[PDB]
Structure formats: structure tokens, C-alpha cells
Amino acid sequence: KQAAVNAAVQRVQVLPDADTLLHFATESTSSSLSALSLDEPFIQKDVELRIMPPVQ
């Protein structure tokens, strides 16, 4: 084989690259939702309810 053809078989050939995905799974990492406009008087929730965090 010649030098121009041997350097061509090498040039025809290519080197790739792999694109890897990064897997993120974040589901856990103030000021209450305003109450609905209803025909009822303003009733305040017990202190034990608005002081303590919701049941997990």
C-alpha cells in the first residue's frame, strides 16, 4: 500500500462521543393559601393547628 492511501484509510475512520444524561429526582428541598369566598363568618383555627407542621 502507498503512503497516500494508508493515510486515507486512517482519515476515513472517525472517533465518536457519548452524551450521558444526568438523573435528578428532587421532590423535597410560608404564607397560607387564602380561604374561599363563602357566606360564613371568619372562624380562626385552633392554635395547635396553625403552630404545628402538617402530618408526614
Binding site: 500500500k1 503512503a3 494508508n6 493515510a7 484509510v9 486512517q10 475512520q13 472517533l15 465518536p16 462521543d17 452524551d19 450521558t20 444524561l21 444526568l22 438523573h23 435528578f24 429526582a25 428532587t26 421532590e27 423535597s28 428541598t29 393559601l33 387564602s34 380561604a35 374561599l36 369566598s37 363563602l38 357566606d39 360564613e40 363568618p41 372562624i43 380562626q44 383555627k45 385552633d46 395547635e48 393547628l49 404545628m52 402538617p54 402530618v55
Partner: protein, 514 residues
């Protein structure tokens, strides 16, 4: 009141258990008027017989005026602990779930507010709403128009969905993703958008809900709020978009989201930058169109600026460098991107990341980025001037030496065999420049390259025979490869499965004599 109404309470219980459903209606209006007053509200609440009569009326009633008055009593009682416990003990939950199927607004408004308070403050309420089938009913109500109602209904969904696989699947099976995506691209009310993004955030970690939010146009819909004043909404959309990103690789019509994230890399907020860098690496993954678009909106400069700004913070650096590696290969604008990293003074920082305190996953990513940057001939000399070659050789040798003691696993999640392949592959491309070849050879790396032809890994043989191929074009170097006893394994690698290894093996054999 505590004496006067306590004797009028068992009277209204008898009147609610009456056979004539006209007397029951008059009684429900009376109990309703008494739930308005504080003193008598406590009296209804303290008696289990009375509450079980109100619950019993509600699910068996056909009259609408009684339905609202009864659900209105339960609404008033739900502001109290003993009231919540009473509603729960008396089977108020399956009764309230049934009321979520009524056409009357006042009833739905009372039933969802009561169920919300129950889910928030009563233990065992979550499981009771699930077993009762309340999720199908709640998702079905996302077609409504009152913004505050939607915000409560969406919060009920969040509380129920959080950490529970079954409830996430019910939401999905009942058209949840589409109904939630509709809300983001329609309403302006902040409390609704924030609560809706939280449900979407919870749903985004489920492997089946994830591709469904994507096909519902969720990426673009969450993309609409990244410019909003409240940071809690921007941040929740970002965490959701980040979770979804590894499944949105094939999604079209992403121009806007990509452009906004590129802009977000410049914020002074650490969490915004970390997320935006993470979303960009995934959306730049195997999608040539996204790669081309990110390069066109000033993405390369933005990412180089991000890495400079980050320093030792790998939460930002790893996805930013991965984004850069993807943008620097397999697309029409790769050549431009390769030059842009240099033109935006990116090479000094990219080479710096190959050195400690940087951990293994970042180094592996940086090596792959350098392989890509080395494809551009205008990067051949500046990469040499930053000291990339002696470090790539140092990384290669130490990694190979660890593979030799482990002949007779993972380190920080990376096999040392991957660092060998990566570094030898980066040197293979760097070896296209004549001066780089002198440097590589001067590092006494030829005896190592010959040893790498004997490895059981096909990909290491390919890059080793490849670097020897580029080095062998200069006669003094080819003679040194021959003097290392490379003729025997390269002749054995001529018979290989991979045509890439065999071509390189043949080229060195030719170059060593002729």
C-alpha cells in the same frame, strides 16, 4: 350556651334521624345557624352522636339547600381539632368525597376546604381519602374556574401525592398532567401557580408521570414562569424542569426554554444557576437541534462564565462542563463551539479542573471536553500552553497503575478504566499537531501506549493504537515504537473485531518500515 345548647343538641340529633325529610331539612338549617356561633359550635363538636347525624344526612340527602347547610357545618367544625377528629371518627371522609361530585359551587367549596383541613391536621386522613377514591374526583375538578378553589384542590393533590406511588399513578390515569399543564399556561394567581408547580414537582420523580408531563407540553409551560417576580415559583418550575429533563431529549419546540436557561446562568442565586446548568446538559444530550440553538443564543460564553464563577463548586461545574462537552461534538455548530470556548477565555479554567480539589466524575467530563476541543486545530497550541498534556499523562499513568494492582471496581462512581480510555483518547486527538507529538513522546509515554494494546477492553486498544498511529508519522518516533516490541501485539490486533483497532494497528506496522 354551654348549658342551654347542650340540652338542645340531642334534640337536633333526633330531628336529623327523623323519617320525614322536611323536618330533617329544617333541622339542618338550625345546626348550620348554630355553627356560626362560637359557644354552640363547640357543643356540636363535643358530641359524637350529633356529628354522625350531620355526616349521615349529607351523603344520603337529595336536597341541595340541605347539602350546603350540612357541608357548611362540617366546614365550621374543621377549624377545630375536636371537630376534625369527630368528622373523621364518624366517616365524614367518604361522605365528603361523594360531595366532590356535586354541580353546586358552595358544596364543593365547603367539601374541599374541609378535606384540606383534614389532610393537613388529622392523622390517617390521607389514607382515608385515597381508599375512598378522592383523587379521581379532585383531578376531575381541575376544569373549574375559581382560582382560590383550584389552589386548595391542587394543594390536596400535593399532600396526597407526596411520597405515594399509587396516588401519583391515579392522578396520571385520570388526566392529571394535562389538567395541571393547562393551569400553568392560563392563570395569573401566584398561589395557584406555585401550588400547581409543587404537584408537578412531586409527579416529575415518577417514571411514568415524567414522560406524560413532557408530551403534555410541560417543559414549555413551566418555561413561561422563569421570569416571574416570586422566586418560589421560578425555583419550583426549575426543580420540576430538572427532574423532567432526562426524558425531554426528543421534545421539539424548545427554543424559548433553552434561551431563558442560558440567561439564568448569569443570576446571583446559587440554586437557579445549578438547576439551569443541569437542565442545559440534559437538553443538550443527543439532540443536534438543541445543540445548535444553545450555541446561537450565547450559550458557550454563558457556560464558560458559569464555570469561572463557580470555582470548586461541582454542583454547578459538572453539568456545565457536560453541557459544554455535548455542544462541542456531533452537530453543524460544533466547530464554532470549539473555537468559542477559546475565544471566551475558557481554556485556562477547563484545564484547571483536571487538577484537585476536583473529584472523579468532573475530571472524566473535563477530559471528554478536552478531546472535543482538540478536534479544532486552533485549539492545539493554547491547550498545550495551559499544561493539558502533562496532566493528561499523569491522570493516565496513575489510573493504569490502579488497574494493574486490581488485576491480582468504582472509585467515586468512576472506573479507572474510563480515565485510561478518556485520557488516551484526548492525547490521540491532541497528537494531530507536530509540537504536541514531541511533548507526548518527551513524557516517556510510548512504553505505556504499547502496554495498553494488551488490555481486554476494545476501546482502550482503539485509542492506544490510535495515538501510536499519529506518533508514527514521524520516523524517529516510529523507530521508538518498533524498539519497544510493539510489532507483536499490533500484528495480533490486525485480526480484531473492531475495524477501527485493526486500521490503526495496520497503519503503525506500515509506518514502522516504509
Amino acid at each position: 350556651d354551654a348549658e342551654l345548647a347542650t340540652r338542645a343538641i340531642p334534640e337536633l340529633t333526633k330531628l336529623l334521624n327523623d323519617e320525614d325529610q322536611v323536618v330533617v331539612n329544617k333541622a339542618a338549617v338550625m345546626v348550620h345557624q348554630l355553627s356560626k356561633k362560637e359557644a354552640s359550635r363547640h357543643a356540636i363538636m363535643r358530641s359524637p352522636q350529633m356529628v354522625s347525624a350531620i355526616v349521615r344526612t349529607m351523603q344520603n340527602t337529595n336536597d341541595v339547600e340541605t347539602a350546603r347547610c350540612t357541608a357548611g357545618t362540617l366546614h365550621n367544625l374543621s377549624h377545630h381539632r375536636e371537630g376534625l377528629l369527630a368528622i373523621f371518627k364518624s366517616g365524614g371522609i367518604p361522605a365528603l368525597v361523594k360531595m366532590l361530585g356535586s354541580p353546586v359551587d358552595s358544596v364543593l367549596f365547603y367539601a374541599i376546604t374541609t378535606l384540606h383541613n383534614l389532610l393537613l391536621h388529622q392523622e390517617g386522613a390521607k389514607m382515608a381519602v385515597r381508599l375512598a377514591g378522592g383523587l379521581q374526583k379532585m383531578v376531575a375538578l381541575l376544569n373549574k374556574t375559581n382560582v382560590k378553589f383550584l389552589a386548595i384542590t391542587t394543594d390536596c393533590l400535593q399532600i396526597l401525592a407526596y411520597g405515594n406511588q399509587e396516588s401519583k399513578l391515579i392522578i396520571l390515569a385520570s388526566g392529571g398532567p394535562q389538567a395541571l399543564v393547562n393551569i400553568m399556561r392560563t392563570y395569573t394567581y401566584e398561589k395557584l401557580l406555585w401550588t400547581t408547580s409543587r404537584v408537578l414537582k412531586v409527579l416529575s420523580v415518577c417514571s411514568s408521570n415524567k414522560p406524560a408531563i413532557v408530551e403534555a407540553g410541560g417543559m414549555q409551560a413551566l418555561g413561561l414562569h422563569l421570569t416571574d417576580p416570586s422566586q418560589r415559583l421560578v425555583q419550583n418550575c426549575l426543580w420540576t424542569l430538572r427532574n423532567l429533563s432526562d426524558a425531554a431529549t426528543k421534545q421539539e419546540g424548545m427554543e424559548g426554554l433553552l434561551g431563558t436557561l442560558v440567561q439564568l446562568l448569569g443570576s446571583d442565586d446559587i440554586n437557579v444557576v445549578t438547576c439551569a446548568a443541569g437542565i442545559l446538559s440534559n437538553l443538550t444530550c443527543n439532540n443536534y437541534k438543541n445543540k445548535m440553538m444553545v450555541c446561537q443564543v450565547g450559550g458557550i460564553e454563558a457556560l464558560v462564565r458559569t464555570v469561572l464563577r463557580a470555582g470548586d463548586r461541582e454542583d454547578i461545574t459538572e453539568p456545565a462542563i457536560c453541557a459544554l462537552r455535548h455542544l462541542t461534538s456531533r452537530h453543524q455548530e460544533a466547530e464554532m463551539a470549539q473555537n468559542a470556548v477559546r475565544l471566551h477565555y475558557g481554556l485556562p479554567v477547563v484545564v484547571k479542573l483536571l487538577h484537585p480539589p476536583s473529584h472523579w466524575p468532573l475530571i472524566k467530563a473535563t477530559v471528554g471536553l478536552i478531546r472535543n476541543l482538540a478536534l479544532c486545530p486552533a485549539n492545539h497550541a493554547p491547550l498545550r500552553e495551559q499544561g493539558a498534556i502533562p496532566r493528561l499523562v499523569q491522570l493516565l499513568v496513575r489510573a493504569h497503575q490502579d488497574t494493574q494492582r486490581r488485576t491480582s471496581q468504582f472509585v467515586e462512581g468512576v472506573r479507572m478504566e474510563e480515565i485510561v480510555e478518556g485520557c488516551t483518547g484526548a492525547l490521540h486527538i491532541l497528537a494531530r499537531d507536530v509540537h504536541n507529538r514531541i511533548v507526548i513522546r518527551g513524557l516517556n509515554t510510548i512504553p505505556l501506549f504499547v502496554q495498553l494494546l494488551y488490555s481486554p477492553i476494545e476501546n482502550i486498544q482503539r485509542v492506544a493504537a490510535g495515538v501510536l498511529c499519529e506518533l508514527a508519522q514521524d520516523k524517529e518516533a516510529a523507530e521508538a515504537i518498533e524498539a519497544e516490541g510493539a510489532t507483536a501485539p499490533l500484528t495480533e490486533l490486525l485480526h480484531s473485531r473492531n475495524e477501527g483497532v485493526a486500521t490503526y494497528a495496520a497503519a503503525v506496522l506500515f509506518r514502522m518500515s516504509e
